[PDB]
Write a protein that binds this ligand. Structure first.
Ligand code: AOW
Ligand code: AOW
Lengths: 327, 324
């Protein structure tokens, strides 16, 4: 008969009850302004099909961020623009300020609010237990907001979280893989970055939801509190599930695939093996014990679960004792 | 023109960091309006509509103000001021800042207020009631002035009263601004009947004392049962109506003192007028609200010279309030 259907435990019908205007990005009309009002200063990063720059707005002498997009897929550009317009002004969401094209190149470009990114390489050596709790709570405010707006980010990872530590400011960026949640919809599993992909993507279960972002957030928490980067170090997408099974165990993996009647790809036959369920306390060492606590391990255990339905939602996560010390 | 500054809270914003008063640099976090269900329309103002609503997460009634985004800088200003004053005595409480997912229209969520009708209070009000509520307004004004803010739109429409619970709230901070000594402000503020002489003669270096003139106009209308007290038909005529009570002599002394150049539009309409005695406005229908203390207090608020008017602090110490 095929796989068993599934739906989100929260914000299930938020898009169903809204007019098509909100979610039908293919029908959205994009107004491209003149890029002559912005002067490019320096390159910040170079991603797949995009380059990010620091720039200056000549009309008010203010710094901005300009993302120049390689127009490989026009439908994908309309999707990112519509999502950014819908989320504009939301808590800890990057703020879209303008949509422009250079007069001669006609290359699509997005203009955002400036963020003064601190170099993290020196920062994780000085980070405290409070700092991790504080910034994890800021990420959860962004996730509960975008999920309430019927949007899944689908690429949560440290590269997509900008922090200005001096001002204690955090922003969730790069909404290029984000999508609108419709119950019963089958999505493409080729999303997120390898180390952050949820088990649903790795076993080809297409009827996933906001809970995918909660797995990716758990991977980030485990790498920070244990000082192990990345936490699940796969070398390919099949090996990535084996790395997860070496921690969570193979017994609970079979319960997951049986609950949803998922057919395991034959490529897992010779590599999966048999693995015991490990205790989270086994990852504690002298270099990371100052970031670990019973509360932190209980919270991590409630995020890193095979069953997407059993993971905490962003709102449930915000009520956990791990955050009792934050404002 | 001659430079002027406030007699109180002069440098309160000067000694605070830039974050406090630089509203243009303030980051506004717009939440999801899906947590609120609109019930009914309460009122419709210029560039705003006020609705009674219910917060679905705690089953509590709230007030939701939907703003027409005519000027984005003005929205940031009102929000920053409401955030700075949040929780202050008799100040409307900002509870949330939201936008509807499809319309993206800016909206402010406030505490609920069960207002008693203004046209209904007017008949059963006593001398004590006027003294009590005037003191409640003074608590809000001394607080916002101490916080370096001038309301600039003090009028009865902006004061909500729950008479059953004896609760008062100063609302509509859309025209409010931060006071900086020596700053020149826009004179196109406040409602016609409540505009101070400084606004009418185009004197831009005004302060917190503007709010004390407006409060004076409110007191005069209540004790004398004359609404409004100064009934101008346009901004130029408004100055003539004040001149009919305070006289044209003291107006020229005010003008000369600050080297104000009178607009030529006043040439054929201002005329010559005598200074009237406050006792002349007492009649059979209002004598139960008038007293020597009330007239002395009123005389100390309604003065052309903004520097000579009582401060909210000085006003709170007047014998008129000895019974509250
Ligand atoms: C490590 C995961 C984690 C777990 C728990 C709490 C915080 C974090 C975290 C969160 C964020 C960062 C800092 N990430 C910066 C990523 C970044 N910095 C940039 C700088 C310039 C451009 C960038 N771009 O993507 O275009 C860019 N992207 C560092 C860390 Cl340590
Ligand atoms: C006895 C106090 C007093 C002393 C001196 C002069 C006037 C009064 C007075 C007399 C009546 C009122 C009541 N004004 C209500 C105005 C109002 N009622 C509303 C009801 C609904 C919405 C409103 N809004 O503007 O958003 C709104 N605004 C307030 C006051 Cl302060």
């Amino acid at each position: 008969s095929g796989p068993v259907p599934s739906r989100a435990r929260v914000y299930t019908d938020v898009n169903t009850h809204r007019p098509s205007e909100y979610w039908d990005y293919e029908s959205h009309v994009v107004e491209w302004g003149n890029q002559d009002d912005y002067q490019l200063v320096r390159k910040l990063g170079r991603g797949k099909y995009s380059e990010v720059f620091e720039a200056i707005n000549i009309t008010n002498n203010e710094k901005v961020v300009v993302k120049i997009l390689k127009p490989v897929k026009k439908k994908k550009i309309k999707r990112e623009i519509k999502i950014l317009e819908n989320l504009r002004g939301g808590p800890n969401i990057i703020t879209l300020a303008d949509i422009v094209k250079d007069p001669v190149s006609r290359t699509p470009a997005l203009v955002f609010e400036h963020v003064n990114n601190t170099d993290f390489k020196q920062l994780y050596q000085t980070l405290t237990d409070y700092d991790i709790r504080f910034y994890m709570y800021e990420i959860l405010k962004a996730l509960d907001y975008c999920h309430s707006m019927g949007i899944m980010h689908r690429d949560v990872k440290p590269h997509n979280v900008m922090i200005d530590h001096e001002h204690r400011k955090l922003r969730l960026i790069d909404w290029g893989l984000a999508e609108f949640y419709h119950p019963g919809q089958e999505y493409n599993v080729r999303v997120a970055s390898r180390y952050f992909k949820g088990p649903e993507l790795l076993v080809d279960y297409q009827m996933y939801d906001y809970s995918l972002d909660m797995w990716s957030l758990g991977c980030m928490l485990a790498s920070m509190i244990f000082r192990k980067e990345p936490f699940f170090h796969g070398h390919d997408n099949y090996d990535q599930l084996v790395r997860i099974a070496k921690v969570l165990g193979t017994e609970d993996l079979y319960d997951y695939i049986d609950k949803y009647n998922i057919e395991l790809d034959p490529r897992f036959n010779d590599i999966l093996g048999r693995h015991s369920r490990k205790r989270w306390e086994r990852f504690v060492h002298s270099e990371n014990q100052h970031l670990v606590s019973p509360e932190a391990l209980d919270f991590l255990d409630k995020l890193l679960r095979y069953d997407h339905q059993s993971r905490l939602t962003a709102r449930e996560a915000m009520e956990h004792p791990y955050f009792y010390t934050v404002v």
